């Protein structure tokens, strides 16, 4: 029997350095990273190569980048395969990605997400251990358009990029309702705008009954609702390197980066739940989520993990040394800001956004064991990311102590219950999800 | 008294060599666009400099890239100072554009509308002659989020990129409409998917009796209407370099590309019209729009011409030899195609898109002159793109027998009727604009 | 409770190896320093990383250019955040300190006060330890005028170069004195000389009852006097930037280089007292002064040390392999001369310059206990340079023996008993400040 450990976690935004404190509790979480046969995490930063050029991404918070040396301390600490698709890794545009996977590669470091094109993008990453091997697939759900990755033509070359896995959103409204907005369409003048795409096209391409209006699809239903679904072309081709990486590998780990809520915030997307049966209908032995900044229920399907959101491992965003003209953009100044008022400002002196609430600073690291691909434990390990502390000393990960540990504990099972999870508690906080097996 | 001719001509889509044929009428068109002082084009093309990748821009038609030779077609053909933005010309990326001003500096081509960041893509270009000096700048309405340019940051670079003219479009609606808008935001349950917005932000940013459901701006007024804006940041700092151009050259021209529509296709949008009496409020000499690929409305303002489309002057699209492969998806296929296929199955065999109808094969050469900055005279030469020849044939420019000229001609004086302007008509076709002067 | 020390220590003017000798007191400094958590040092010589070429800087003492080897030495002795601004970082011009940036980085050596441009020479350093941070800021009030840094502007690229501290000095005299100036100044025919600035500017530019004459400002006092004054704008942005890295790090700490005496050459010029206060009433943990390559005083100012001059930690001047034609020409020679024939003339054989005499040999290493911000401790470590030595041997730091730790930190008390500071003093010759905690 072969017998391997990974341990997961969530996004790793890291900016400074001395990531790993002279703590004990942090010492502790670094000697349980590096126990284990692989370690993942999601690079929420670019590290930069000094190539490339900020991108606009108000919408994912700002820019993200950070000294290469960053990539020191997430090794460091323990992490050793390293998935790359997610909504910044694209904040210095395609050189800034090929700088990235350059700065990688010649660190040694496994990744995935990105790539020269989108087979390069799409592919595992193979970690060779002397226990065994580590297959890691890594896509976006939450990206800006364009930055999806592109292979190539027999004429032209790909683009650099991430691994995408786009998804389409369904209004479902009344028809009395439907009918207001073919009234609204026609009598504010927008369908008269159009009237050139219906003898270029040859009809009107708002009418799919479905109907596409404001860049949003409407469909006619019984009762007003809302759905989500995969993109077919990404579902299907994620799904079969699944397939391919299954062959090659003990372990086949799907990462995989989501904003996007369900109906409350709490919930993923219904069509990122499509996504996690697939991967493990596919062969998959886990499924790691991330995106939200917090944490999200942990799903048991055909016994095998899917944990939909680890939160951040590392939070240092208010700490970045590089802010672009268009992010200080959002902030009205009377005079030039540096970055640390910046981000004060952006924040209303920390009243605002991520600050003031608890659920943005805890975090959990599974650690998982299987044997002969069988999933025979998943221990939980509570992490404290030091909610209420200086701006300078927040973000930073220690294994939580008892009291935190069992709060975050309680949170994780609350947000699992809906999907049938029992987790066992020991007396230091930490616990492990009940298995059928 | 300084004399200055100036040459306008519309979108150059140019992807072939021999852009001049040996007809007569066509050389006719070179002698004219030779004679001149200064000949204003739209570079609509990529010309490649071997770096960038292809993006995604379906919307815009597919890539546009073309062998650098077809440079030296546009400056054999008579064509002297370049306006490059459009949403064309990050077909390549940033890389792309910074190989394109490469290109043009090396073989000292004048050239506006792009640059290494926002100021140099804002800054007029100045060409000057012996007879003086023309100060060119050129902006796009119409390109994809992230392309235009960016300054750089105190610790940041900045990004090339295109000269933006950005614009929001606003839906006036009833009272009666605004409420089932709002009832279908919250039944749906979209509104509960702003949940954590709420939180983060502090209120629902869906409210700003202002409403922004699906992407649009909904506004509450008596009849149901639809209005556009300039973006007052982009109208207010193209207006200053406008100022800053007239104070250091004779004539200012600005160049702006635009696709969108107003109440009709033949109308430009109202934002344009504000946009253009800016820039002649500002002291611009002429503005010359392009972008719909047929012929829209003449209109004297303050004694000074606005060309709202000039259409293209070269139309070579479907003779590319660069197809990328994201535009290839948009056909679907049984084998592998090759470029010309695609181009001929895009269209059906040439029953859709531009082939079958005349405005998109007839253009417009306005040859404008001044003296001491005075409009004296704005002569109109209509150009023939070759309607209904083969596909290797048509899209190269000539200077229009009589026949074809009159009904040209006609035409824009029904287009730029409601403006008020007259034409005066030769026997040749030609015409020339009645001028309050 | 966090609990950080930091070594600090004065010029760093090394060009040979072995820096560390096999002395016991020597391994017994490196010992010290290696036991802290953060040891600084001014790194007072230009590592040759090829490129640059000499400038003329014959006021601070020809040019000071070493191997880059001399790097390791510093961080294998136990320096670990280097301050850069001062007057020999652009001995090799802008291209120098580009060479010197690329070659810190490559080692791995945080470092400021030099960039590639102002802000980047203004920006703090972060140095993240296990036990916690430090943010370095460096700057120097004596330097070449245009050797500052510059900021890019929109046309323009920036320069490197090295974060200022300008001053100004102001002469006050009499009525009776001012009259014979400004008598002076027309009866020599120098008023004169301006007649076309007065035309041109629109007044005599010397009026500023201001004065400006001979370069220098007079004001008319009551009685004789002599005053100096920062520059507001580098005291204003120096300042902004301490407020910026208190948000970030849990000790700041300024280091500022200046030459320039008080009314006696132990005292620091009073604009370098308001630079130093206001540095701590913005944040600062510590303010640590070199430049005079003697000891000054030590004041205590809101419970946080200033150490005005920490004088040389290595001083080998006259051991420098890399003399400039321009520094050869200070020295008359019959044939032509080598470096340490240069070095031995321009002294008159040792009998001036700085080897006669005991204050330039003498220096001294606080190391300070911070906790949770507040300073808990500052002992005083004595170092010997060794007066009197060979000159290939003296210039290279050990802990001094009792005899001679007495005497420097009798001379330390001294110098600082104007301020009120009081020491302890160990059994060994080192000593403490009285802290008021
Ligand atoms: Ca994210
Ligand atoms: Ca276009
Ligand atoms: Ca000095």
Chains 1, 2, 3 share one sequence.
């Not at 944990?307 to 992010?327: C, H, K, M």
């Not at 209303?348 to 609430?357: C, I, M, S, V």
Request: proline residues 7%; contains cysteine.
């Amino acid at each position: 029997m072969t017998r391997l450990t990974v341990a997961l976690s969530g996004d790793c935004m890291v900016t400074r350095g001395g990531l790993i404190t002279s703590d004990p509790a942090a010492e502790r979480l670094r000697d349980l990273l590096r126990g284990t046969d692989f370690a993942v995490t999601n690079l929420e930063v670019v590290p930069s190569d000094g190539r490339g050029h900020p991108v606009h991404n108000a919408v994912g918070g700002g820019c993200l980048i950070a000294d290469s040396a960053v990539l020191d301390e997430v090794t460091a600490a323990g992490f050793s395969v390293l998935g790359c698709a997610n909504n910044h890794a694209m904040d210095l545009g395609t050189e800034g990605v090929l700088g990235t996977m350059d700065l990688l590669r010649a660190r040694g470091i496994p990744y995935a997400g990105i790539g020269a094109d989108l087979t390069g993008a799409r592919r595992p990453v193979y970690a060779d251990r002397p226990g065994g091997s580590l297959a890691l697939l890594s896509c976006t759900a939450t990206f800006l358009p364009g930055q999806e990755a592109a292979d190539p033509s027999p004429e032209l070359p790909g683009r650099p990029g991430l691994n995408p896995l786009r998804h389409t959103a369904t209004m479902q409204v009344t028809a009395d309702q439907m009918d207001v907005l073919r009234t609204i369409d026609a009598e504010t003048g927008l369908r008269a705008r159009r009237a050139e795409a219906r003898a270029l096209l040859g009809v009107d391409p708002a009418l799919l009954d479905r109907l596409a209006l404001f860049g949003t699809r409407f469909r006619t239903a019984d009762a007003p609702g809302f759905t989500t679904e995969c993109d077919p072309r990404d579902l299907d081709e994620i799904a079969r390197w699944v397939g391919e990486a299954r062959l090659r590998a003990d372990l086949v780990v799907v990462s995989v980066h989501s904003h996007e809520p369900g109906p409350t915030p709490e919930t993923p997307g219904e069509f990122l739940r499509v996504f996690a049966h697939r991967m493990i209908d596919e062969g998959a032995h886990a499924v790691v989520g991330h995106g939200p900044h917090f944490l999200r229920g942990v799903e048991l399907y055909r016994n095998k993990p899917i944990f939909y959101s680890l939160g951040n491992i590392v939070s240092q965003i208010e700490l970045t040394d590089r802010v672009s003209a268009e992010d200080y953009a959002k902030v009205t100044a009377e005079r030039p800001l540096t970055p640390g008022r910046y981000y004060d400002r952006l924040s209303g002196h920390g009243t605002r956004l991520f600050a003031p609430h608890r659920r943005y600073w805890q975090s959990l690291v599974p650690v998982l064991t299987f044997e002969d691909g069988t999933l025979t434990a998943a221990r939980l390990h509570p992490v404290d990311l030091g909610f209420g502390r200086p701006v300078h000393r927040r973000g930073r990960p220690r294994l939580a102590d008892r009291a935190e540990a069992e709060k975050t504990l309680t949170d994780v099972a609350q947000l699992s219950q809906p999907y049938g999870t029992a987790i066992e508690v020991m007396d230091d906080g930490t616990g492990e999800l009940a298995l059928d097996v």
